[PDB]
């Protein structure tokens, strides 16, 4: 007698992890970037760059 085409069934689980990294920024160089008070020359200074 013949044979039948067998097959199997597999169930797998998703194992969860997570990575993280961080940096900072100095309070002295905070307002130097976003601060829109600098009118005419500090907007193209060297320390801003």
């Amino acid at each position: 007698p013949a044979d039948q085409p067998v097959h199997n069934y597999m169930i797998k689980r998703l194992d969860r992890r997570s990575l993280n990294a961080a940096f900072s920024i100095a309070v002295e160089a905070l307002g130097l970037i976003s601060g829109e008070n600098l009118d005419g020359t500090h907007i193209s200074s060297a320390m801003r760059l």
Binding site: E28, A29, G35, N37, H42, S45, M47
Partner: protein
């Protein structure tokens, strides 16, 4: 009630003592020194230095 009579610094008399100039990035560039000398006069004495 009671108001708060504000005072302006420039309109005082003491303002004549010091010169006040708005330097915005001091908090950042103060990390080092600035180190400017001023002067000294000297009399031309006879006899070869």
């Amino acid at each position: 009630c009671s108001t708060l009579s504000l005072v302006r610094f420039l309109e005082l008399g003491l303002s004549v003592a010091c010169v006040c100039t708005k330097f915005p990035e001091l908090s950042y560039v103060a990390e080092g020194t600035i180190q400017f000398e001023v002067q000294q006069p000297m009399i031309a004495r006879d006899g070869p230095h």
